Amino acid sequence: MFENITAAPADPILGLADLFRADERPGKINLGIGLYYDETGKIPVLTSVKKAEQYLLENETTKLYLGIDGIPEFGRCTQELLFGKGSALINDKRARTAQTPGGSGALRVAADFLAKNTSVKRVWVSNPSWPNHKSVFNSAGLEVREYAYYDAENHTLDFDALINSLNEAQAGDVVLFHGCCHNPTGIDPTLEQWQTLAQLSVEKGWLPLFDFAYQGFARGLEEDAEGLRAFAAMHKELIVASSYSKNFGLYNERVGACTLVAADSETVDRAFSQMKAAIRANYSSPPAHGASVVATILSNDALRAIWEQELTDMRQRIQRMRQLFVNTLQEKGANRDFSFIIKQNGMFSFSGLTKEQVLRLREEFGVYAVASGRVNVAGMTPDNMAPLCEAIVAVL
Amino acid sequence: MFENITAAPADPILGLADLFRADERPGKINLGIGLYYDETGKIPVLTSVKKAEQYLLENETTKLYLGIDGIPEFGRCTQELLFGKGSALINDKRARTAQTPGGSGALRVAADFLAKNTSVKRVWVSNPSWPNHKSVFNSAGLEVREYAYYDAENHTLDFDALINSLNEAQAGDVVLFHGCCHNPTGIDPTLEQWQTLAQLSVEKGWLPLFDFAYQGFARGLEEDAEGLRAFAAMHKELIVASSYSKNFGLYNERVGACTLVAADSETVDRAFSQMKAAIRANYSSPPAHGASVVATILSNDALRAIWEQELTDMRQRIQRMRQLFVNTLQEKGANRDFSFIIKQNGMFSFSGLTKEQVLRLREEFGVYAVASGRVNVAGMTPDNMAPLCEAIVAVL
Ligand SMILES: Cc1ncc(COP(=O)(O)O)c(CN[C@@H](Cc2ccc(O)cc2)C(=O)O)c1O
Ligand SMILES: Cc1ncc(COP(=O)(O)O)c(CN[C@@H](Cc2ccc(O)cc2)C(=O)O)c1O
């Protein structure tokens, strides 16, 4: 049976890892995958989480199957964190949430729900975009089409080119928006541009699906949900695929949520029921550990207090490593003017290096960036800066 | 968008939980979902588990993304428990293993891999079978045909209707077997009956797909893997969906595995890149806790030793709950002769009860079995024995 099977091509991102993990060179830097690092070059486990885990250790009496929808309380929490204190979405009981294996699994769940229970045939995804967006959607049968976004020549959001693109989307189409910290550009639309698309997309008849894997690294919690919050006000229906792998450091435990919002509760209920079935034929029920951490924390004032500060801390060191990055570039002999890098939010930076640059940075200096020229600021440290900035400077 | 969505009818097993949960009558018993219970009727967390968790607590420095295929250890270990320490398979590097969100997720990973890369068209699954095999396979767009298996009248494995109903299996079809502990019958083919099927399947050109989710509750670890190991000798190609949910009480952390057998290293290799690819479009990478807890315990002679006993002890108490069940049954009324029960393996028993019988125990006595009339031995205790045996008796 498998004599004919053909070797697939590796994950452009995740596959880099393997590569990295294999060079035996000394000074190898890894600006690949989006991992938050600390000053001392490591991927710590936050403190609020070890505290959460200890609590679990001494408190857990069973490993009982969770519901298909996970821990209720983790849901309440995701919602509040998503919509706000006493939103009508919550007051109206218009949202139903499901704990899933990461934000990558909230996607896959969404798209099996859409295709099986809807008339959705197409999903529009920005250009550029997170390479897995397509494969996820494709796998559920859906067609993926791309809209314009990124003004190369000037490092922004080309609004009108964006708008003009989406004028080709039929009603009933699904439009895919990154909540904040666009991956991999780092550019995000103002509150007005969100208010815009918000009105538009309502008139145009689109289904908006928000990929929110970074609440907290742009400006902060409550303010990084604005776009999303503008949308909710308008729409009767929407879907959000959220991740807690970056803001809780829980990468390998897989914590995320799939939120569904309908016109009302009777609906949402009916609709949610089908979502479950989508799960039940996938993985059945979600993993406990990681999500129980999340609720525990979000539920406790002290622990929360602690986590929030851990967050703002992660964010601030990033904002720091970015200023530091250009400065040194500048101070190191860099052709281009990189200051547009200080206009990008989140863990990355859409560098501007060509495929052959990124290819050379690696074979020749041991540096590791995604071929799009995506660079992970969070992987930058005062101890690697110089050497880093020197290789780049040599390849430019 | 969601205005015409048809509510779905709930999972037949998990759905039962909901009902149990919301029921308020004091003496309610729950013989539904396959969860191991203790003398006092709790679903305790194994000592070897707690122990390994502690270890992780103290020693975990990171939550870094696992690989697509998970913890190498975890795999290396799974194949061993699957094929046996010395096995050629291992020595021939013909197996590849991916850590997954349970036995469910492995099933699904199997389906999405087949579907997408094989030209497999139909999957054959017993009658009766576990109700999710269908849903899983369908959702991958596969045809589910049934083979015959259980001989009601004398409660047994009719090898005859078995062999005859599979005569229509086609070459390239996929035959699906429960390695041991048949859910929901509890009847298994003998090493001989196994030796034979292995012979056919070869001769008739089938892809066997083993569903192993209870290794250790029949006879014991190595004993229960006979059928599988017989197959492994003959076959060149094989698929195995394993789960640790029951033998390690890890129900809610989703731990199981998917093993791919091929003729050679190169093959399995190519063929596994494809599998990974299928993983990347679903959930990305596996959840770490639970699996880490398994490699921990299986790589440590000591905790291992502690493990193998908690298991042995779970089995023993089950077998005791069996012989006590019939004993109290007879000794309490019973027209029927339930003596065939003692001949079933694992947590359940195909009771021989009526749809309308289980509807009444539930409604009138708080008892909770599945509709097929499948009862959990494991959810039986010395304290509840009487009261259950009374209602069952009053509905005969
Ligand atoms: C925008 C975006 N959305 C979702 C995800 C996946 O999040 P999880 O919660 O499932 O981890 C990511 C992840 N992006 C990171 C990490 C990653 C993970 C898997 C694969 O295949 C590739 C990358 C990244 O490297 O950009 C998003 O970025
Ligand atoms: C026969 C069978 N095969 C596989 C599995 C996989 O369970 P995992 O928890 O490892 O994924 C099971 C488990 N079935 C139990 C519990 C259950 C699980 C999911 C759903 O939807 C319903 C019940 C059972 O009671 O049969 C098998 O049983």
Side-chain angles (χ1 to χ4, degrees), chain A residues 317-359:
Chain A
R317 184 187 112 62
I318 313 163
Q319 315 190 151
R320 154 153 65 90
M321 278 301 107
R322 66 164 102 269
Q323 312 250 359
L324 177 63
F325 172 56
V326 10
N327 279 182
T328 312
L329 270 169
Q330 237 271 145
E331 114 176 350
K332 272 228 196 268
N335 281 332
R336 321 140 184 64
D337 159 59
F338 280 93
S339 10
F340 56 95
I341 270 134
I342 351 248
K343 155 207 225 137
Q344 322 203 321
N345 37 25
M347 302 197 337
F348 318 90
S349 115
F350 217 31
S351 86
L353 291 174
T354 60
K355 262 104 246 107
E356 50 312 76
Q357 266 160 334
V358 162
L359 217 167

Short mmCIF file of all heavy atoms in Angstrom, two decimals, chain A residues 317-359:
data_model
loop_
_atom_site.label_atom_id
_atom_site.label_comp_id
_atom_site.label_asym_id
_atom_site.label_seq_id
_atom_site.Cartn_x
_atom_site.Cartn_y
_atom_site.Cartn_z
N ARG A 317 10.23 43.52 27.16
CA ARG A 317 11.55 43.12 26.74
C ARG A 317 11.59 42.96 25.27
O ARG A 317 12.65 42.92 24.62
CB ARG A 317 11.88 41.77 27.32
CG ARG A 317 13.29 41.27 27.05
CD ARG A 317 13.43 39.82 27.54
NE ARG A 317 13.59 38.92 26.41
CZ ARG A 317 14.64 39.05 25.62
NH1 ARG A 317 15.51 39.99 25.94
NH2 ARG A 317 14.86 38.28 24.54
N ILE A 318 10.41 42.80 24.71
CA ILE A 318 10.42 42.65 23.29
C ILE A 318 10.56 44.03 22.69
O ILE A 318 11.45 44.24 21.85
CB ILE A 318 9.31 41.80 22.69
CG1 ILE A 318 9.14 40.48 23.42
CG2 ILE A 318 9.66 41.50 21.22
CD1 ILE A 318 7.80 39.81 23.10
N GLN A 319 9.71 44.96 23.17
CA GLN A 319 9.74 46.33 22.70
C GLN A 319 11.16 46.87 22.75
O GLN A 319 11.55 47.65 21.89
CB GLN A 319 8.75 47.26 23.44
CG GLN A 319 7.35 46.63 23.63
CD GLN A 319 6.26 47.58 24.15
OE1 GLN A 319 5.07 47.40 23.85
NE2 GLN A 319 6.65 48.58 24.95
N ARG A 320 11.92 46.35 23.73
CA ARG A 320 13.32 46.69 24.04
C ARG A 320 14.33 46.10 23.07
O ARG A 320 15.25 46.77 22.58
CB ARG A 320 13.67 46.30 25.47
CG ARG A 320 15.14 46.03 25.69
CD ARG A 320 15.56 46.30 27.14
NE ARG A 320 14.91 45.41 28.11
CZ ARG A 320 15.38 44.21 28.53
NH1 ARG A 320 16.55 43.73 28.06
NH2 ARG A 320 14.70 43.47 29.42
N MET A 321 14.15 44.82 22.79
CA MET A 321 15.00 44.13 21.85
C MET A 321 14.81 44.70 20.42
O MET A 321 15.69 44.57 19.57
CB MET A 321 14.73 42.63 21.90
CG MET A 321 15.44 41.91 23.03
SD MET A 321 17.26 42.07 23.00
CE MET A 321 17.40 43.22 24.39
N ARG A 322 13.64 45.32 20.14
CA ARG A 322 13.45 45.90 18.82
C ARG A 322 14.21 47.17 18.62
O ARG A 322 14.93 47.27 17.64
CB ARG A 322 12.13 45.72 18.07
CG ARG A 322 10.92 46.39 18.69
CD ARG A 322 9.75 46.49 17.71
NE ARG A 322 8.71 45.49 17.89
CZ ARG A 322 8.75 44.34 17.26
NH1 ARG A 322 9.76 44.04 16.46
NH2 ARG A 322 7.78 43.46 17.43
N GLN A 323 14.10 48.12 19.57
CA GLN A 323 14.85 49.37 19.50
C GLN A 323 16.31 49.01 19.38
O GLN A 323 17.01 49.40 18.48
CB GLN A 323 14.67 50.27 20.73
CG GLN A 323 13.20 50.45 21.13
CD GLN A 323 12.67 51.84 20.88
OE1 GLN A 323 13.42 52.72 20.40
NE2 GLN A 323 11.38 52.03 21.18
N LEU A 324 16.74 48.18 20.31
CA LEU A 324 18.10 47.71 20.35
C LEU A 324 18.59 47.15 19.02
O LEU A 324 19.73 47.36 18.63
CB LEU A 324 18.25 46.69 21.50
CG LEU A 324 19.64 46.03 21.65
CD1 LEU A 324 20.74 47.07 21.98
CD2 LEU A 324 19.60 44.92 22.71
N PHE A 325 17.71 46.44 18.31
CA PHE A 325 18.02 45.79 17.02
C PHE A 325 18.35 46.77 15.91
O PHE A 325 19.36 46.65 15.23
CB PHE A 325 16.97 44.69 16.65
CG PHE A 325 17.08 44.09 15.27
CD1 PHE A 325 18.25 43.48 14.81
CD2 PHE A 325 15.97 44.11 14.41
CE1 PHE A 325 18.34 42.92 13.54
CE2 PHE A 325 16.04 43.56 13.14
CZ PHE A 325 17.22 42.97 12.71
N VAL A 326 17.51 47.77 15.72
CA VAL A 326 17.85 48.71 14.68
C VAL A 326 19.13 49.44 15.03
O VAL A 326 20.06 49.42 14.23
CB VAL A 326 16.75 49.67 14.26
CG1 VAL A 326 15.55 49.61 15.19
CG2 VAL A 326 17.29 51.09 14.17
N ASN A 327 19.14 50.08 16.21
CA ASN A 327 20.27 50.86 16.74
C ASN A 327 21.60 50.24 16.40
O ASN A 327 22.48 50.86 15.83
CB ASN A 327 20.18 51.08 18.26
CG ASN A 327 19.25 52.19 18.66
OD1 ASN A 327 19.11 52.50 19.86
ND2 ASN A 327 18.61 52.80 17.66
N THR A 328 21.73 48.99 16.76
CA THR A 328 22.92 48.25 16.52
C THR A 328 23.15 48.03 15.03
O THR A 328 24.31 47.97 14.55
CB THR A 328 22.77 46.91 17.25
OG1 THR A 328 22.32 47.16 18.57
CG2 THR A 328 24.06 46.07 17.22
N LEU A 329 22.04 47.86 14.29
CA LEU A 329 22.18 47.65 12.85
C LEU A 329 22.91 48.85 12.30
O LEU A 329 23.97 48.74 11.70
CB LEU A 329 20.83 47.41 12.12
CG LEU A 329 20.42 45.92 12.06
CD1 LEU A 329 18.97 45.78 11.59
CD2 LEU A 329 21.37 45.11 11.18
N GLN A 330 22.29 49.99 12.63
CA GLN A 330 22.73 51.33 12.30
C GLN A 330 24.18 51.53 12.69
O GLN A 330 25.03 51.98 11.94
CB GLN A 330 21.90 52.31 13.12
CG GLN A 330 21.16 53.33 12.25
CD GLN A 330 22.00 54.55 11.99
OE1 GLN A 330 21.95 55.15 10.91
NE2 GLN A 330 22.81 54.92 12.99
N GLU A 331 24.44 51.19 13.93
CA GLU A 331 25.77 51.33 14.44
C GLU A 331 26.69 50.28 13.86
O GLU A 331 27.89 50.32 14.07
CB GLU A 331 25.75 51.21 15.96
CG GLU A 331 26.49 49.97 16.46
CD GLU A 331 26.55 49.90 17.95
OE1 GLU A 331 26.21 50.82 18.67
OE2 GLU A 331 26.99 48.74 18.39
N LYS A 332 26.15 49.33 13.13
CA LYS A 332 27.04 48.29 12.62
C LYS A 332 27.39 48.27 11.13
O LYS A 332 28.19 47.42 10.71
CB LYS A 332 26.67 46.93 13.14
CG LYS A 332 27.36 46.65 14.46
CD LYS A 332 28.03 45.29 14.50
CE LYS A 332 28.37 44.89 15.92
NZ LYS A 332 29.72 45.32 16.31
N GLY A 333 26.82 49.18 10.33
CA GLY A 333 27.11 49.24 8.90
C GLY A 333 26.00 48.69 8.01
O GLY A 333 26.27 47.95 7.08
N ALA A 334 24.75 49.07 8.31
CA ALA A 334 23.60 48.60 7.56
C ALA A 334 23.14 49.57 6.47
O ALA A 334 22.87 50.75 6.71
CB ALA A 334 22.45 48.25 8.49
N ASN A 335 23.04 49.02 5.26
CA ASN A 335 22.60 49.76 4.10
C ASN A 335 21.26 50.37 4.40
O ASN A 335 21.13 51.56 4.70
CB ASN A 335 22.47 48.86 2.85
CG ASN A 335 23.79 48.58 2.19
OD1 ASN A 335 24.72 49.40 2.27
ND2 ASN A 335 23.89 47.43 1.54
N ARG A 336 20.24 49.54 4.34
CA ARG A 336 18.90 50.02 4.57
C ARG A 336 18.65 50.70 5.91
O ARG A 336 19.35 50.55 6.91
CB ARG A 336 17.81 49.00 4.24
CG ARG A 336 18.07 48.15 2.99
CD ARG A 336 17.66 46.69 3.17
NE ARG A 336 17.99 45.83 2.02
CZ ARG A 336 19.23 45.55 1.60
NH1 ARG A 336 20.27 46.09 2.24
NH2 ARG A 336 19.46 44.77 0.55
N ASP A 337 17.58 51.47 5.87
CA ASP A 337 17.05 52.16 7.01
C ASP A 337 15.99 51.19 7.52
O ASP A 337 15.00 50.94 6.83
CB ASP A 337 16.39 53.50 6.61
CG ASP A 337 15.41 53.98 7.64
OD1 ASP A 337 15.73 54.19 8.79
OD2 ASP A 337 14.19 54.12 7.18
N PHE A 338 16.26 50.61 8.69
CA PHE A 338 15.39 49.61 9.29
C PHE A 338 14.37 50.13 10.30
O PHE A 338 13.59 49.36 10.85
CB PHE A 338 16.27 48.59 9.97
CG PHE A 338 16.86 47.59 9.03
CD1 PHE A 338 18.12 47.77 8.46
CD2 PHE A 338 16.16 46.42 8.76
CE1 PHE A 338 18.68 46.82 7.61
CE2 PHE A 338 16.69 45.45 7.91
CZ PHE A 338 17.95 45.66 7.34
N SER A 339 14.38 51.43 10.57
CA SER A 339 13.48 52.00 11.55
C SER A 339 12.01 51.65 11.40
O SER A 339 11.23 51.94 12.30
CB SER A 339 13.70 53.47 11.76
OG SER A 339 14.58 53.93 10.77
N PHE A 340 11.62 51.02 10.30
CA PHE A 340 10.21 50.65 10.18
C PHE A 340 9.96 49.47 11.09
O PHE A 340 8.82 49.09 11.36
CB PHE A 340 9.78 50.30 8.75
CG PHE A 340 10.66 49.21 8.23
CD1 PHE A 340 10.29 47.86 8.32
CD2 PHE A 340 11.91 49.52 7.70
CE1 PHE A 340 11.14 46.86 7.86
CE2 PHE A 340 12.76 48.53 7.23
CZ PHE A 340 12.39 47.19 7.33
N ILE A 341 11.06 48.89 11.59
CA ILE A 341 10.97 47.77 12.49
C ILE A 341 10.39 48.20 13.82
O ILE A 341 9.76 47.43 14.53
CB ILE A 341 12.26 47.02 12.66
CG1 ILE A 341 12.34 45.92 11.60
CG2 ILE A 341 12.30 46.40 14.05
CD1 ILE A 341 13.70 45.83 10.89
N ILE A 342 10.57 49.46 14.16
CA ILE A 342 10.00 49.91 15.42
C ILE A 342 8.53 50.24 15.30
O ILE A 342 7.93 50.82 16.20
CB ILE A 342 10.69 51.15 15.97
CG1 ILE A 342 11.92 51.46 15.16
CG2 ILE A 342 11.05 50.93 17.43
CD1 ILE A 342 13.17 51.24 15.98
N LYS A 343 7.94 49.93 14.15
CA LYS A 343 6.55 50.23 13.94
C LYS A 343 5.71 48.95 13.94
O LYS A 343 4.50 48.95 13.78
CB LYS A 343 6.39 51.09 12.68
CG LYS A 343 5.04 51.02 11.97
CD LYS A 343 5.14 51.33 10.48
CE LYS A 343 4.06 52.27 9.96
NZ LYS A 343 4.59 53.30 9.04
N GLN A 344 6.40 47.84 14.15
CA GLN A 344 5.80 46.53 14.17
C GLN A 344 5.58 46.04 15.58
O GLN A 344 6.48 46.12 16.41
CB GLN A 344 6.73 45.52 13.50
CG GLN A 344 7.43 46.11 12.27
CD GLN A 344 7.88 45.04 11.31
OE1 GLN A 344 8.34 43.96 11.73
NE2 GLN A 344 7.76 45.33 10.01
N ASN A 345 4.40 45.47 15.84
CA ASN A 345 4.16 44.94 17.16
C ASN A 345 4.26 43.41 17.21
O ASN A 345 4.35 42.76 16.16
CB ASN A 345 2.94 45.55 17.89
CG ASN A 345 1.77 45.86 16.99
OD1 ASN A 345 1.64 45.23 15.94
ND2 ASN A 345 0.90 46.80 17.39
N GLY A 346 4.30 42.83 18.41
CA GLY A 346 4.38 41.39 18.62
C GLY A 346 5.78 40.79 18.57
O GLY A 346 6.80 41.48 18.43
N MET A 347 5.83 39.46 18.62
CA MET A 347 7.07 38.71 18.60
C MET A 347 7.91 38.80 17.34
O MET A 347 9.08 38.35 17.32
CB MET A 347 6.81 37.23 18.87
CG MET A 347 6.12 36.96 20.19
SD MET A 347 6.29 35.23 20.68
CE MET A 347 6.60 34.51 19.05
N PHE A 348 7.35 39.30 16.25
CA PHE A 348 8.17 39.31 15.05
C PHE A 348 8.57 40.65 14.52
O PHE A 348 8.44 41.72 15.14
CB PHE A 348 7.65 38.44 13.88
CG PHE A 348 7.12 37.09 14.27
CD1 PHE A 348 5.77 36.94 14.58
CD2 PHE A 348 7.94 35.97 14.32
CE1 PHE A 348 5.25 35.71 14.96
CE2 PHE A 348 7.43 34.72 14.69
CZ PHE A 348 6.08 34.59 15.02
N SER A 349 9.09 40.49 13.30
CA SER A 349 9.60 41.50 12.45
C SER A 349 9.77 40.94 11.04
O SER A 349 10.54 39.99 10.80
CB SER A 349 10.96 41.98 12.94
OG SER A 349 11.97 41.64 11.99
N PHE A 350 9.04 41.57 10.11
CA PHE A 350 9.13 41.26 8.69
C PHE A 350 10.37 41.97 8.15
O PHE A 350 10.31 43.05 7.56
CB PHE A 350 7.86 41.65 7.90
CG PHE A 350 7.50 40.65 6.80
CD1 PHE A 350 7.80 39.30 6.93
CD2 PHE A 350 6.87 41.06 5.63
CE1 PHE A 350 7.50 38.38 5.93
CE2 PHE A 350 6.53 40.16 4.63
CZ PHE A 350 6.85 38.81 4.77
N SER A 351 11.52 41.34 8.41
CA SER A 351 12.84 41.84 8.09
C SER A 351 13.11 42.58 6.79
O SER A 351 13.67 43.68 6.81
CB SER A 351 13.94 40.87 8.38
OG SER A 351 14.11 40.01 7.29
N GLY A 352 12.79 41.97 5.66
CA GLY A 352 13.07 42.59 4.37
C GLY A 352 14.22 41.89 3.64
O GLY A 352 14.65 42.31 2.57
N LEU A 353 14.71 40.79 4.22
CA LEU A 353 15.77 40.03 3.61
C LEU A 353 15.22 39.07 2.57
O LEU A 353 14.19 38.42 2.78
CB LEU A 353 16.51 39.15 4.65
CG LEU A 353 17.35 39.89 5.70
CD1 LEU A 353 17.86 38.85 6.69
CD2 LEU A 353 18.55 40.57 5.05
N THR A 354 15.92 38.91 1.47
CA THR A 354 15.49 38.00 0.44
C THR A 354 15.68 36.55 0.81
O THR A 354 16.33 36.23 1.79
CB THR A 354 16.28 38.22 -0.85
OG1 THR A 354 17.66 38.00 -0.58
CG2 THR A 354 16.04 39.62 -1.40
N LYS A 355 15.12 35.67 -0.01
CA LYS A 355 15.24 34.26 0.21
C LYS A 355 16.69 33.89 0.19
O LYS A 355 17.19 33.14 1.02
CB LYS A 355 14.46 33.45 -0.80
CG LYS A 355 13.10 33.02 -0.26
CD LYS A 355 11.95 33.84 -0.83
CE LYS A 355 11.23 34.71 0.19
NZ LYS A 355 11.54 36.15 0.03
N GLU A 356 17.41 34.41 -0.78
CA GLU A 356 18.82 34.10 -0.80
C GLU A 356 19.67 34.74 0.32
O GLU A 356 20.81 34.35 0.58
CB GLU A 356 19.52 33.50 -2.08
CG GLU A 356 19.27 34.22 -3.43
CD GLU A 356 17.82 34.53 -3.72
OE1 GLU A 356 17.20 35.43 -3.20
OE2 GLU A 356 17.31 33.74 -4.63
N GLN A 357 19.08 35.73 1.01
CA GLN A 357 19.79 36.38 2.11
C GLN A 357 19.72 35.47 3.33
O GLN A 357 20.75 35.04 3.86
CB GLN A 357 19.29 37.81 2.39
CG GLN A 357 20.15 38.81 1.62
CD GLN A 357 19.51 40.16 1.40
OE1 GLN A 357 18.29 40.29 1.37
NE2 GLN A 357 20.36 41.17 1.24
N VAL A 358 18.47 35.14 3.68
CA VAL A 358 18.07 34.26 4.75
C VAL A 358 18.74 32.92 4.64
O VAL A 358 18.97 32.24 5.64
CB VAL A 358 16.59 34.01 4.61
CG1 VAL A 358 16.20 32.76 5.41
CG2 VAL A 358 15.78 35.22 5.02
N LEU A 359 19.03 32.52 3.40
CA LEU A 359 19.66 31.24 3.09
C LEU A 359 21.12 31.32 3.35
O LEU A 359 21.81 30.35 3.67
CB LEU A 359 19.47 30.88 1.61
CG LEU A 359 19.24 29.39 1.42
CD1 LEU A 359 18.75 29.12 0.00
CD2 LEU A 359 20.54 28.63 1.69
#
